Amino acid sequence: QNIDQPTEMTATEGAIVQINCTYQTSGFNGLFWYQQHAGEAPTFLSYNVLDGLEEKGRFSSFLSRSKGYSYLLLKELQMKDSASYLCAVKDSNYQLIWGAGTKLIIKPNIQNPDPAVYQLRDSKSSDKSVCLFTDFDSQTNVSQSKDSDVYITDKCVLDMMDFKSNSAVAWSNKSDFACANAFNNSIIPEDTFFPSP
Amino acid sequence: IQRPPKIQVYSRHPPEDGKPNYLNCYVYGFHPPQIEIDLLKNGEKIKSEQSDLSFSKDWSFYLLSHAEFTPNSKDQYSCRVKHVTLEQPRIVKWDRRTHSLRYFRLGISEPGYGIPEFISAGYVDSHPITMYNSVSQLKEPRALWMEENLAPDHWERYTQLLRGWQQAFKVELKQLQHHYNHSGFHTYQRMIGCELLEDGSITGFLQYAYDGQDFLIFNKDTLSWMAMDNVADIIRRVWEANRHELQYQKNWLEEECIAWLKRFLEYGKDALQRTEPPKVRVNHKTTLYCRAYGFYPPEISINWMKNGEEIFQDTDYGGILPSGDGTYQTWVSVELQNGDIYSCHVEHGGVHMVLQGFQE
Amino acid sequence: AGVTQTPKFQVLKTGQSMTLQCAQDMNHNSMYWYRQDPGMGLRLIYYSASEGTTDKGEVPNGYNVSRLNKREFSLRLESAAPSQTSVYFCASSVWTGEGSGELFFGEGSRLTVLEDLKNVFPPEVAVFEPSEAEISHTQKATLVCLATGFYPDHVELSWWVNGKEVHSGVCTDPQPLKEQPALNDSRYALSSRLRVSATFWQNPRNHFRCQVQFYGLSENDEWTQDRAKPVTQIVSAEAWGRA
């Protein structure tokens, strides 16, 4: 009848994450874990029926029929692990109950942080100006603006060698917009650069 | 293999030469299921009812053919059975607590040969409860307390599953005939199920048969399939390669099956937990007959005695026969010194019953 | 092999009929149609254990289904509704009633149903050249692409360098944000970044272009409006290297 799992989780590259899943069904004929990348087909990950652990590479899934509990354990997190993880249980009748997946966000491992805010050139094919906040650590937070006419988008996901780097983009139409006030009130470490005029 | 039918003709209730009783022709232990049983009155053919095709644990089939009523007013009643293991039709004249759950499957190689290609029947304590065939593809109850306690959504859900399992059974059959390098009339059987012992112990089983002989047997403890063939060994390697499926079967047999069993037991607590004692009758025709009528459960023990020890020589066993009420009946005979006492011994609830039959 | 699903994107006016095709190449027997919505687990609309038989699922209301072959399973909706906006998945398994048998999904089908097609617009695309301050400091260069003012959310952004598609150094937003979150009739924005070495950027012979594939009205779609018909189109913006 019911199945629950975390909505969102956030972890850094190279770490270990554990996604719990609790269910209460009429009967039990198995538990599945599915991985779904954004805008792509869900794919089968693991399966459990008997109590115990199931290890396949970096991925492992645990099950407790008595507790109605299961966790997916991801070791040595890579950037490609960032996806939604669907938990599913077969009913007493062989029907399949899906829980609303857990979205996992993987932050890159930056060994040499160098956070700064840069002012990109105007485009001549656009009427808006953009500002780039980049090369910051995972311990850095950048959120939305208190302004409505200014748009800020971090949380970008890398493609599948790569120049993997955390980056946030701020843009707007107004003239009051400068790259000195764009990323104001961001949780900020020491030494990060904001230009002045 | 091919097994000849065992036949017994008897009456539901002891005849009264005026009380209309039910004539029964129990045909059992046969394979293939190709059979036709006819009841006879002095040679003439009588309109008679025939039960659903049912299966025993040894892969053999059995049928209960009964006539609507027989008063038995000075006539000759018999039975005609024709089978592939018989040259001429056999004739037989009429003369006068652990609970379990089983699910069977019977598959017949293409084409029909007259019989439905797929049949699936469920049993609890040898009470028919469910039925499905390839002709009318419908989830149907064979017990009153089954339909009354199961909503119509349950039968609709399993009628869909069965259609899937029907198709899967058809493919597995073709795959077997190809492996055995032969075509034509061949049968395929599956039996799954569990049982709950009196003390609380539980067991489960999954078995397959080709042409009525053991093909594949599953062991849920070591998670392995046993094969007694060079052909069945092929499938064994395919099935055992899928470890997740093996695990799933263990879970179903140990947890899921038992759950269903207890669920159905509560539904039919009235009929399944009852105990009706046997009525013992003794007759002579030499040969002494000892009957026991209308008992439940089927578990019973009968033996003739002589002063007053058990007789092993010149005896007939009879076996447990269906009565038709939901009760059962059996019989034991002995062929016949001076001043000796012959009496029939019967134990049911145990509760030892003894009826003195004959003395000098 | 795989489970083929067409189309990937569709826009419909309320009341329109439309059918989704699904082909399975794995010689499977069971086929399913799922409906993925935010905040909810997958829900089954219709399914078929094998050819010749089909049955309703958890939410069959407003949907029809047909099994053509052992290969094909089609989803039909005769009268589209705004509530039927979702991402439909076609799935396939070997058998039903099996335990460990996993599901094989198709790439996915994005569906958005509207009352009016008057708010359908292609994205505005623009590329912003790397900051001179970034190049001299980190010896790296970051291009930024913005796809704005598009509706509905039916876009696929990609980067192209010298006529070939690139993947390394590329960071695109997972989903587009709404420009005017307060309004329900709001259009979406989508940003993306391409980072390359300073030497590679400072070569004027290198050509960079951001490309956004929009999925809108087909050739046979109704368009009684005066403005340009917002059909399926590739909107791009280019930028040359600077010494």
PDB file of all heavy atoms in Angstrom, chain C residues 3-33, unseen atoms left out:
ATOM      1  N   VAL C   3      14.006  -1.115 -26.390  1.00  0.00           N
ATOM      2  CA  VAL C   3      12.583  -0.812 -26.461  1.00  0.00           C
ATOM      3  C   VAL C   3      12.366   0.562 -27.094  1.00  0.00           C
ATOM      4  O   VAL C   3      12.598   1.591 -26.464  1.00  0.00           O
ATOM      5  CB  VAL C   3      11.935  -0.832 -25.066  1.00  0.00           C
ATOM      6  CG1 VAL C   3      10.475  -0.421 -25.151  1.00  0.00           C
ATOM      7  CG2 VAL C   3      12.065  -2.206 -24.447  1.00  0.00           C
ATOM      8  N   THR C   4      11.920   0.570 -28.344  1.00  0.00           N
ATOM      9  CA  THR C   4      11.783   1.807 -29.102  1.00  0.00           C
ATOM     10  C   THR C   4      10.449   2.499 -28.841  1.00  0.00           C
ATOM     11  O   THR C   4       9.394   1.871 -28.878  1.00  0.00           O
ATOM     12  CB  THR C   4      11.938   1.551 -30.610  1.00  0.00           C
ATOM     13  OG1 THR C   4      13.172   0.865 -30.854  1.00  0.00           O
ATOM     14  CG2 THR C   4      11.930   2.864 -31.379  1.00  0.00           C
ATOM     15  N   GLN C   5      10.509   3.803 -28.589  1.00  0.00           N
ATOM     16  CA  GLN C   5       9.321   4.579 -28.246  1.00  0.00           C
ATOM     17  C   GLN C   5       9.251   5.891 -29.032  1.00  0.00           C
ATOM     18  O   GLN C   5      10.193   6.684 -29.034  1.00  0.00           O
ATOM     19  CB  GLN C   5       9.311   4.855 -26.743  1.00  0.00           C
ATOM     20  CG  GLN C   5       8.135   5.663 -26.243  1.00  0.00           C
ATOM     21  CD  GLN C   5       8.168   5.823 -24.739  1.00  0.00           C
ATOM     22  OE1 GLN C   5       9.094   5.351 -24.074  1.00  0.00           O
ATOM     23  NE2 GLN C   5       7.158   6.483 -24.190  1.00  0.00           N
ATOM     24  N   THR C   6       8.130   6.107 -29.710  1.00  0.00           N
ATOM     25  CA  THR C   6       7.932   7.316 -30.502  1.00  0.00           C
ATOM     26  C   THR C   6       6.577   7.943 -30.186  1.00  0.00           C
ATOM     27  O   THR C   6       5.599   7.235 -29.960  1.00  0.00           O
ATOM     28  CB  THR C   6       8.006   7.040 -32.029  1.00  0.00           C
ATOM     29  OG1 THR C   6       6.830   6.343 -32.456  1.00  0.00           O
ATOM     30  CG2 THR C   6       9.248   6.226 -32.394  1.00  0.00           C
ATOM     31  N   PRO C   7       6.517   9.281 -30.156  1.00  0.00           N
ATOM     32  CA  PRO C   7       7.672  10.174 -30.282  1.00  0.00           C
ATOM     33  C   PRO C   7       8.270  10.494 -28.918  1.00  0.00           C
ATOM     34  O   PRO C   7       7.867   9.905 -27.916  1.00  0.00           O
ATOM     35  CB  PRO C   7       7.053  11.433 -30.881  1.00  0.00           C
ATOM     36  CG  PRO C   7       5.688  11.459 -30.293  1.00  0.00           C
ATOM     37  CD  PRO C   7       5.245  10.026 -30.197  1.00  0.00           C
ATOM     38  N   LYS C   8       9.223  11.417 -28.885  1.00  0.00           N
ATOM     39  CA  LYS C   8       9.812  11.853 -27.627  1.00  0.00           C
ATOM     40  C   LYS C   8       9.134  13.113 -27.097  1.00  0.00           C
ATOM     41  O   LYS C   8       9.059  13.319 -25.890  1.00  0.00           O
ATOM     42  CB  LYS C   8      11.316  12.069 -27.785  1.00  0.00           C
ATOM     43  CG  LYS C   8      12.066  10.780 -28.093  1.00  0.00           C
ATOM     44  CD  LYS C   8      13.572  10.964 -28.015  1.00  0.00           C
ATOM     45  CE  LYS C   8      14.300   9.653 -28.283  1.00  0.00           C
ATOM     46  NZ  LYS C   8      15.773   9.800 -28.150  1.00  0.00           N
ATOM     47  N   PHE C   9       8.630  13.945 -28.004  1.00  0.00           N
ATOM     48  CA  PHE C   9       7.969  15.189 -27.628  1.00  0.00           C
ATOM     49  C   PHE C   9       6.696  15.397 -28.431  1.00  0.00           C
ATOM     50  O   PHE C   9       6.662  15.122 -29.628  1.00  0.00           O
ATOM     51  CB  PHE C   9       8.898  16.381 -27.852  1.00  0.00           C
ATOM     52  CG  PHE C   9      10.085  16.407 -26.941  1.00  0.00           C
ATOM     53  CD1 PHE C   9      11.282  15.816 -27.320  1.00  0.00           C
ATOM     54  CD2 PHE C   9      10.007  17.022 -25.702  1.00  0.00           C
ATOM     55  CE1 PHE C   9      12.376  15.841 -26.479  1.00  0.00           C
ATOM     56  CE2 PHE C   9      11.099  17.049 -24.854  1.00  0.00           C
ATOM     57  CZ  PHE C   9      12.285  16.457 -25.244  1.00  0.00           C
ATOM     58  N   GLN C  10       5.656  15.892 -27.772  1.00  0.00           N
ATOM     59  CA  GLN C  10       4.407  16.215 -28.449  1.00  0.00           C
ATOM     60  C   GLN C  10       3.654  17.335 -27.747  1.00  0.00           C
ATOM     61  O   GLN C  10       3.551  17.360 -26.523  1.00  0.00           O
ATOM     62  CB  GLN C  10       3.508  14.984 -28.552  1.00  0.00           C
ATOM     63  CG  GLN C  10       3.562  14.281 -29.893  1.00  0.00           C
ATOM     64  CD  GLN C  10       2.971  15.110 -31.010  1.00  0.00           C
ATOM     65  OE1 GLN C  10       2.022  15.867 -30.801  1.00  0.00           O
ATOM     66  NE2 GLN C  10       3.529  14.975 -32.206  1.00  0.00           N
ATOM     67  N   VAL C  11       3.131  18.264 -28.537  1.00  0.00           N
ATOM     68  CA  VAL C  11       2.252  19.303 -28.026  1.00  0.00           C
ATOM     69  C   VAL C  11       0.864  19.084 -28.622  1.00  0.00           C
ATOM     70  O   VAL C  11       0.733  18.826 -29.819  1.00  0.00           O
ATOM     71  CB  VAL C  11       2.765  20.704 -28.398  1.00  0.00           C
ATOM     72  CG1 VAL C  11       1.884  21.769 -27.776  1.00  0.00           C
ATOM     73  CG2 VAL C  11       4.200  20.874 -27.938  1.00  0.00           C
ATOM     74  N   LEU C  12      -0.166  19.170 -27.784  1.00  0.00           N
ATOM     75  CA  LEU C  12      -1.535  18.938 -28.230  1.00  0.00           C
ATOM     76  C   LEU C  12      -2.495  19.978 -27.679  1.00  0.00           C
ATOM     77  O   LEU C  12      -2.353  20.422 -26.543  1.00  0.00           O
ATOM     78  CB  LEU C  12      -2.003  17.551 -27.796  1.00  0.00           C
ATOM     79  CG  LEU C  12      -1.295  16.355 -28.428  1.00  0.00           C
ATOM     80  CD1 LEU C  12      -1.707  15.071 -27.731  1.00  0.00           C
ATOM     81  CD2 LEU C  12      -1.614  16.296 -29.911  1.00  0.00           C
ATOM     82  N   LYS C  13      -3.473  20.365 -28.493  1.00  0.00           N
ATOM     83  CA  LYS C  13      -4.578  21.195 -28.025  1.00  0.00           C
ATOM     84  C   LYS C  13      -5.610  20.276 -27.383  1.00  0.00           C
ATOM     85  O   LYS C  13      -5.828  19.163 -27.865  1.00  0.00           O
ATOM     86  CB  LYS C  13      -5.206  21.971 -29.186  1.00  0.00           C
ATOM     87  N   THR C  14      -6.227  20.725 -26.293  1.00  0.00           N
ATOM     88  CA  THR C  14      -7.220  19.912 -25.590  1.00  0.00           C
ATOM     89  C   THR C  14      -8.325  19.413 -26.521  1.00  0.00           C
ATOM     90  O   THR C  14      -9.002  20.201 -27.180  1.00  0.00           O
ATOM     91  CB  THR C  14      -7.859  20.671 -24.408  1.00  0.00           C
ATOM     92  OG1 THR C  14      -8.531  21.839 -24.892  1.00  0.00           O
ATOM     93  CG2 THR C  14      -6.803  21.084 -23.401  1.00  0.00           C
ATOM     94  N   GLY C  15      -8.490  18.097 -26.582  1.00  0.00           N
ATOM     95  CA  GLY C  15      -9.525  17.498 -27.401  1.00  0.00           C
ATOM     96  C   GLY C  15      -8.951  16.675 -28.533  1.00  0.00           C
ATOM     97  O   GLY C  15      -9.653  15.875 -29.152  1.00  0.00           O
ATOM     98  N   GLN C  16      -7.665  16.870 -28.803  1.00  0.00           N
ATOM     99  CA  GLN C  16      -6.998  16.150 -29.881  1.00  0.00           C
ATOM    100  C   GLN C  16      -6.739  14.685 -29.545  1.00  0.00           C
ATOM    101  O   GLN C  16      -6.542  14.323 -28.384  1.00  0.00           O
ATOM    102  CB  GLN C  16      -5.681  16.830 -30.247  1.00  0.00           C
ATOM    103  CG  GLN C  16      -5.838  18.078 -31.075  1.00  0.00           C
ATOM    104  CD  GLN C  16      -4.506  18.656 -31.487  1.00  0.00           C
ATOM    105  OE1 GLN C  16      -3.704  19.053 -30.644  1.00  0.00           O
ATOM    106  NE2 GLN C  16      -4.255  18.693 -32.791  1.00  0.00           N
ATOM    107  N   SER C  17      -6.741  13.848 -30.577  1.00  0.00           N
ATOM    108  CA  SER C  17      -6.408  12.438 -30.432  1.00  0.00           C
ATOM    109  C   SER C  17      -4.959  12.223 -30.845  1.00  0.00           C
ATOM    110  O   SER C  17      -4.440  12.929 -31.710  1.00  0.00           O
ATOM    111  CB  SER C  17      -7.333  11.568 -31.289  1.00  0.00           C
ATOM    112  OG  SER C  17      -7.168  11.848 -32.669  1.00  0.00           O
ATOM    113  N   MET C  18      -4.307  11.250 -30.218  1.00  0.00           N
ATOM    114  CA  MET C  18      -2.911  10.962 -30.511  1.00  0.00           C
ATOM    115  C   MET C  18      -2.534   9.582 -29.998  1.00  0.00           C
ATOM    116  O   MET C  18      -3.064   9.121 -28.989  1.00  0.00           O
ATOM    117  CB  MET C  18      -2.011  12.027 -29.885  1.00  0.00           C
ATOM    118  CG  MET C  18      -0.689  12.220 -30.605  1.00  0.00           C
ATOM    119  SD  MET C  18       0.658  11.413 -29.743  1.00  0.00           S
ATOM    120  CE  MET C  18       0.374  12.020 -28.083  1.00  0.00           C
ATOM    121  N   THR C  19      -1.622   8.920 -30.701  1.00  0.00           N
ATOM    122  CA  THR C  19      -1.193   7.580 -30.314  1.00  0.00           C
ATOM    123  C   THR C  19       0.331   7.459 -30.183  1.00  0.00           C
ATOM    124  O   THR C  19       1.083   8.003 -30.990  1.00  0.00           O
ATOM    125  CB  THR C  19      -1.718   6.507 -31.293  1.00  0.00           C
ATOM    126  OG1 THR C  19      -1.214   6.767 -32.608  1.00  0.00           O
ATOM    127  CG2 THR C  19      -3.244   6.512 -31.331  1.00  0.00           C
ATOM    128  N   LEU C  20       0.779   6.745 -29.158  1.00  0.00           N
ATOM    129  CA  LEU C  20       2.206   6.516 -28.958  1.00  0.00           C
ATOM    130  C   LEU C  20       2.586   5.107 -29.399  1.00  0.00           C
ATOM    131  O   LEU C  20       1.909   4.143 -29.054  1.00  0.00           O
ATOM    132  CB  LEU C  20       2.587   6.726 -27.488  1.00  0.00           C
ATOM    133  CG  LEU C  20       2.170   8.058 -26.858  1.00  0.00           C
ATOM    134  CD1 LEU C  20       2.669   8.161 -25.429  1.00  0.00           C
ATOM    135  CD2 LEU C  20       2.684   9.218 -27.682  1.00  0.00           C
ATOM    136  N   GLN C  21       3.659   4.990 -30.171  1.00  0.00           N
ATOM    137  CA  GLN C  21       4.136   3.684 -30.614  1.00  0.00           C
ATOM    138  C   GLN C  21       5.244   3.145 -29.709  1.00  0.00           C
ATOM    139  O   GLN C  21       6.115   3.888 -29.257  1.00  0.00           O
ATOM    140  CB  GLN C  21       4.623   3.740 -32.066  1.00  0.00           C
ATOM    141  CG  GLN C  21       3.548   3.449 -33.100  1.00  0.00           C
ATOM    142  CD  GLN C  21       2.501   4.537 -33.174  1.00  0.00           C
ATOM    143  OE1 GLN C  21       2.825   5.725 -33.232  1.00  0.00           O
ATOM    144  NE2 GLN C  21       1.233   4.140 -33.169  1.00  0.00           N
ATOM    145  N   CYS C  22       5.201   1.847 -29.435  1.00  0.00           N
ATOM    146  CA  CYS C  22       6.268   1.204 -28.680  1.00  0.00           C
ATOM    147  C   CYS C  22       6.615  -0.158 -29.263  1.00  0.00           C
ATOM    148  O   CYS C  22       5.762  -1.035 -29.366  1.00  0.00           O
ATOM    149  CB  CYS C  22       5.889   1.052 -27.209  1.00  0.00           C
ATOM    150  SG  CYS C  22       7.169   0.223 -26.239  1.00  0.00           S
ATOM    151  N   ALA C  23       7.875  -0.329 -29.642  1.00  0.00           N
ATOM    152  CA  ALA C  23       8.332  -1.588 -30.211  1.00  0.00           C
ATOM    153  C   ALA C  23       9.417  -2.213 -29.347  1.00  0.00           C
ATOM    154  O   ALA C  23      10.377  -1.549 -28.958  1.00  0.00           O
ATOM    155  CB  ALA C  23       8.831  -1.380 -31.632  1.00  0.00           C
ATOM    156  N   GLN C  24       9.254  -3.496 -29.053  1.00  0.00           N
ATOM    157  CA  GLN C  24      10.230  -4.240 -28.268  1.00  0.00           C
ATOM    158  C   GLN C  24      10.981  -5.256 -29.139  1.00  0.00           C
ATOM    159  O   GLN C  24      10.375  -6.064 -29.844  1.00  0.00           O
ATOM    160  CB  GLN C  24       9.541  -4.906 -27.074  1.00  0.00           C
ATOM    161  CG  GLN C  24      10.092  -6.261 -26.700  1.00  0.00           C
ATOM    162  CD  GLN C  24       9.128  -7.370 -27.041  1.00  0.00           C
ATOM    163  OE1 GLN C  24       9.534  -8.440 -27.487  1.00  0.00           O
ATOM    164  NE2 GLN C  24       7.841  -7.121 -26.831  1.00  0.00           N
ATOM    165  N   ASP C  25      12.307  -5.199 -29.082  1.00  0.00           N
ATOM    166  CA  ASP C  25      13.165  -5.972 -29.974  1.00  0.00           C
ATOM    167  C   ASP C  25      13.796  -7.152 -29.244  1.00  0.00           C
ATOM    168  O   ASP C  25      14.650  -7.852 -29.787  1.00  0.00           O
ATOM    169  CB  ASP C  25      14.262  -5.063 -30.534  1.00  0.00           C
ATOM    170  CG  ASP C  25      14.945  -5.644 -31.754  1.00  0.00           C
ATOM    171  OD1 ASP C  25      14.287  -6.388 -32.512  1.00  0.00           O
ATOM    172  OD2 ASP C  25      16.143  -5.351 -31.956  1.00  0.00           O
ATOM    173  N   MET C  26      13.364  -7.377 -28.009  1.00  0.00           N
ATOM    174  CA  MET C  26      14.014  -8.357 -27.148  1.00  0.00           C
ATOM    175  C   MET C  26      13.238  -9.663 -27.050  1.00  0.00           C
ATOM    176  O   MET C  26      13.549 -10.512 -26.213  1.00  0.00           O
ATOM    177  CB  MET C  26      14.226  -7.768 -25.755  1.00  0.00           C
ATOM    178  CG  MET C  26      15.091  -6.524 -25.748  1.00  0.00           C
ATOM    179  SD  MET C  26      15.085  -5.692 -24.154  1.00  0.00           S
ATOM    180  CE  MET C  26      16.472  -4.572 -24.350  1.00  0.00           C
ATOM    181  N   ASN C  27      12.235  -9.812 -27.912  1.00  0.00           N
ATOM    182  CA  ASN C  27      11.382 -11.001 -27.929  1.00  0.00           C
ATOM    183  C   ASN C  27      10.705 -11.238 -26.581  1.00  0.00           C
ATOM    184  O   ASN C  27      10.616 -12.362 -26.106  1.00  0.00           O
ATOM    185  CB  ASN C  27      12.174 -12.237 -28.369  1.00  0.00           C
ATOM    186  CG  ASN C  27      11.278 -13.394 -28.767  1.00  0.00           C
ATOM    187  OD1 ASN C  27      10.133 -13.197 -29.170  1.00  0.00           O
ATOM    188  ND2 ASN C  27      11.796 -14.611 -28.649  1.00  0.00           N
ATOM    189  N   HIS C  28      10.235 -10.159 -25.967  1.00  0.00           N
ATOM    190  CA  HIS C  28       9.561 -10.234 -24.677  1.00  0.00           C
ATOM    191  C   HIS C  28       8.076 -10.524 -24.848  1.00  0.00           C
ATOM    192  O   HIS C  28       7.555 -10.464 -25.958  1.00  0.00           O
ATOM    193  CB  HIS C  28       9.753  -8.930 -23.905  1.00  0.00           C
ATOM    194  CG  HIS C  28      11.131  -8.754 -23.347  1.00  0.00           C
ATOM    195  ND1 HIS C  28      11.547  -7.587 -22.745  1.00  0.00           N
ATOM    196  CD2 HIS C  28      12.185  -9.603 -23.290  1.00  0.00           C
ATOM    197  CE1 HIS C  28      12.798  -7.722 -22.344  1.00  0.00           C
ATOM    198  NE2 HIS C  28      13.209  -8.937 -22.663  1.00  0.00           N
ATOM    199  N   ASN C  29       7.398 -10.829 -23.744  1.00  0.00           N
ATOM    200  CA  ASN C  29       5.977 -11.164 -23.783  1.00  0.00           C
ATOM    201  C   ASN C  29       5.068 -10.164 -23.070  1.00  0.00           C
ATOM    202  O   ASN C  29       3.956  -9.902 -23.512  1.00  0.00           O
ATOM    203  CB  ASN C  29       5.741 -12.578 -23.248  1.00  0.00           C
ATOM    204  CG  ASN C  29       6.273 -13.648 -24.181  1.00  0.00           C
ATOM    205  OD1 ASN C  29       7.412 -14.096 -24.044  1.00  0.00           O
ATOM    206  ND2 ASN C  29       5.449 -14.064 -25.140  1.00  0.00           N
ATOM    207  N   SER C  30       5.544  -9.605 -21.967  1.00  0.00           N
ATOM    208  CA  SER C  30       4.769  -8.613 -21.234  1.00  0.00           C
ATOM    209  C   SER C  30       5.163  -7.200 -21.639  1.00  0.00           C
ATOM    210  O   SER C  30       6.347  -6.903 -21.810  1.00  0.00           O
ATOM    211  CB  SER C  30       4.973  -8.793 -19.734  1.00  0.00           C
ATOM    212  OG  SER C  30       4.715 -10.130 -19.363  1.00  0.00           O
ATOM    213  N   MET C  31       4.166  -6.332 -21.791  1.00  0.00           N
ATOM    214  CA  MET C  31       4.413  -4.931 -22.125  1.00  0.00           C
ATOM    215  C   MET C  31       3.535  -3.980 -21.309  1.00  0.00           C
ATOM    216  O   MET C  31       2.377  -4.280 -21.018  1.00  0.00           O
ATOM    217  CB  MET C  31       4.241  -4.689 -23.627  1.00  0.00           C
ATOM    218  CG  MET C  31       5.390  -5.237 -24.459  1.00  0.00           C
ATOM    219  SD  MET C  31       5.512  -4.496 -26.093  1.00  0.00           S
ATOM    220  CE  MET C  31       4.314  -5.476 -26.991  1.00  0.00           C
ATOM    221  N   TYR C  32       4.100  -2.831 -20.947  1.00  0.00           N
ATOM    222  CA  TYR C  32       3.453  -1.905 -20.024  1.00  0.00           C
ATOM    223  C   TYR C  32       3.508  -0.465 -20.528  1.00  0.00           C
ATOM    224  O   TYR C  32       4.336  -0.121 -21.369  1.00  0.00           O
ATOM    225  CB  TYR C  32       4.140  -1.962 -18.657  1.00  0.00           C
ATOM    226  CG  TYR C  32       4.385  -3.354 -18.110  1.00  0.00           C
ATOM    227  CD1 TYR C  32       5.478  -4.102 -18.524  1.00  0.00           C
ATOM    228  CD2 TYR C  32       3.539  -3.907 -17.158  1.00  0.00           C
ATOM    229  CE1 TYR C  32       5.708  -5.366 -18.023  1.00  0.00           C
ATOM    230  CE2 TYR C  32       3.762  -5.168 -16.651  1.00  0.00           C
ATOM    231  CZ  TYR C  32       4.850  -5.895 -17.085  1.00  0.00           C
ATOM    232  OH  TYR C  32       5.084  -7.154 -16.582  1.00  0.00           O
ATOM    233  N   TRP C  33       2.625   0.375 -20.001  1.00  0.00           N
ATOM    234  CA  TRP C  33       2.673   1.810 -20.259  1.00  0.00           C
ATOM    235  C   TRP C  33       2.556   2.579 -18.951  1.00  0.00           C
ATOM    236  O   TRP C  33       1.540   2.485 -18.260  1.00  0.00           O
ATOM    237  CB  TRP C  33       1.565   2.239 -21.216  1.00  0.00           C
ATOM    238  CG  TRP C  33       1.953   2.151 -22.657  1.00  0.00           C
ATOM    239  CD1 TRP C  33       1.596   1.179 -23.540  1.00  0.00           C
ATOM    240  CD2 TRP C  33       2.772   3.075 -23.386  1.00  0.00           C
ATOM    241  NE1 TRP C  33       2.138   1.437 -24.776  1.00  0.00           N
ATOM    242  CE2 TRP C  33       2.866   2.596 -24.708  1.00  0.00           C
ATOM    243  CE3 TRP C  33       3.434   4.258 -23.051  1.00  0.00           C
ATOM    244  CZ2 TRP C  33       3.595   3.259 -25.692  1.00  0.00           C
ATOM    245  CZ3 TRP C  33       4.159   4.913 -24.031  1.00  0.00           C
ATOM    246  CH2 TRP C  33       4.234   4.411 -25.334  1.00  0.00           C
TER     247      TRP C  33
END
